[PDB]
Design a protein around this ligand. Structure first.
Ligand SMILES: O=c1[nH]c2cc(C(F)(F)F)c(N3CCOCC3)cc2n(CP(=O)(O)O)c1=O
Lengths: 325, 107, 44
């Protein structure tokens, strides 16, 4: 039988250098306040020396947390260019109009406008159709080529190495904790550069609390990434408004465990119990229960409207024609 | 139970190992192929109203041939022009997008 | 899952090796070794 009790100071397990006193749960174990510690207590060397850790009941590590307009069709071909191509458009339908009494000019102006709406050997207007064709050929080629560069360049933070290779997206960790101290002491290639950046990054890329870090990621429009424990991260991803996600694998291999006073009777029993629970998939089941189960979490169109608009305009021109007749 | 295990020096688990005409349906989205077909018959039906039951079938097959892409009746005239400008943009988009795909090329 | 150093029940090397593994991991020596044989020594 057991009695669940919350640690006084509400800390995990650290050791004040001066007083050399343990605090939090790890403390209450060494000083006989409690018989066992069942919590997300990290298995560290500094603690394994004073207390006993059962096999990990949950492996984790450090992870990364990140967060139409029809005007994309008017950009490729500049508004100024759409204009001139229309001025030259009627500029050709008027030149052809001079090639071929008041109504006879209207029927013709509508025919040259149909010869305009794009697709004998009168040399005059002949070279006009040829030059106009070569003109539109260049333009449509330019539009196509230009539209490709905007799509080529248009073609995500996957791993940690991606954070070091770029600078556009800022990133940081908690101002105090094993997470920050990890990069500082890490002698690994990638993590080294990362720390060098965060160490002198301005403004401060470090946050006061975990809540502040998440808020910074949700308010930077994807310009700021936050590094934290995978466990807490995965949980955040399953919380409203569901605007955060973990990317890539963990940066290191850690693990929580059940802590028991050195040379305790519950030592071996609990250890085996953890192994038994994991093999029965009971541990994985529990996590799924509280993390996921209990969790809470254009351009082409613009050309379609101009088409239907043209169809409607025609359906209008049709009706009037039958009326006059 | 029989021996003693030190703390894990390497955490692991069970993973998945793996090694497509669907690279043609991607450039132009399935949703776009649909609408371009709806507007396709949407024009062959508008033209069909421009030109007894069989006479409508022969015409609907003629406007469907005027649909399957390539006098001065201003009405249906601007329809053919606007529809041409429409397909021009689409085929240009497909070409441009496919080029991006062939440049970067990143179940 | 997870691999570990196995030692006969009630051995003298028991506790020492256990702490050694924890020390190596915290010094990032374990991660370093893996990178050496998996990716660094890798052909891809
Ligand atoms: O034993 C420890 N277990 C811990 C477990 C967790 C959590 F994941 F929430 F369960 C956290 N957080 C991660 C996210 O930020 C808020 C709190 C900190 C822990 N710390 C402090 P560290 O010194 O920064 O590692 C320990 O010492």
């Amino acid at each position: 039988k057991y009695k669940l009790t919350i640690v006084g100071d509400g800390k995990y397990g650290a050791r004040d250098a001066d007083t050399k006193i343990w605090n939090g749960m790890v403390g209450e174990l060494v000083y006989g306040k409690a018989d066992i510690a069942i919590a997300p207590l990290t298995i560290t060397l500094v603690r394994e020396e004073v207390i006993d850790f059962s096999k990990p009941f949950m492996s984790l590590g450090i992870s990364i947390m990140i967060k139409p307009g029809v005007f994309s069709f008017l950009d490729p071909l500049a508004y100024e260019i759409w204009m001139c191509i229309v001025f030259a458009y009627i500029g050709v339908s008027v030149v052809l109009f001079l090639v071929s009494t008041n109504e006879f000019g209207i029927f013709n102006s509508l025919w040259f406008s149909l010869g305009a709406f794009m697709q004998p050997r009168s040399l005059s207007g002949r070279i006009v159709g040829g030059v106009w064709w070569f003109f539109t050929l260049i333009i449509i080629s330019s539009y196509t080529a230009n539209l490709a560069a905007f799509l080529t360049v248009e073609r995500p933070i996957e791993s940690a190495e991606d954070l070091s290779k770029q600078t556009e997206i800022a990133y940081g960790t908690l101002d105090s904790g094993s997470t920050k101290e990890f990069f500082r002491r890490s002698k690994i290639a990638v993590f080294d550069k990362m720390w060098t950046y965060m160490r002198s990054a301005e403004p401060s890329v470090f946050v006061r609390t975990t809540a502040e870090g998440v808020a910074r990621v949700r308010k930077s429009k994807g310009k700021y990434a936050y590094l934290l424990e995978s466990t807490m991260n995965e949980y955040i991803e399953q919380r409203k408004p569901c605007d955060t996600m973990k990317v890539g694998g963990n940066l290191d291999s850690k693990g929580y465990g059940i802590a028991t006073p050195k040379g305790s009777s519950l030592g071996t029993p609990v250890n085996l119990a953890v192994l038994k629970l994991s093999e029965q998939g009971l541990l994985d089941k529990l996590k799924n229960k509280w993390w996921y189960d209990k969790g809470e979490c254009s351009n082409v169109a613009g050309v379609f409207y101009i088409l239907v608009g043209g169809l409607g305009l025609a359906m209008l021109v049709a009706l009037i024609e039958f009326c006059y007749k």
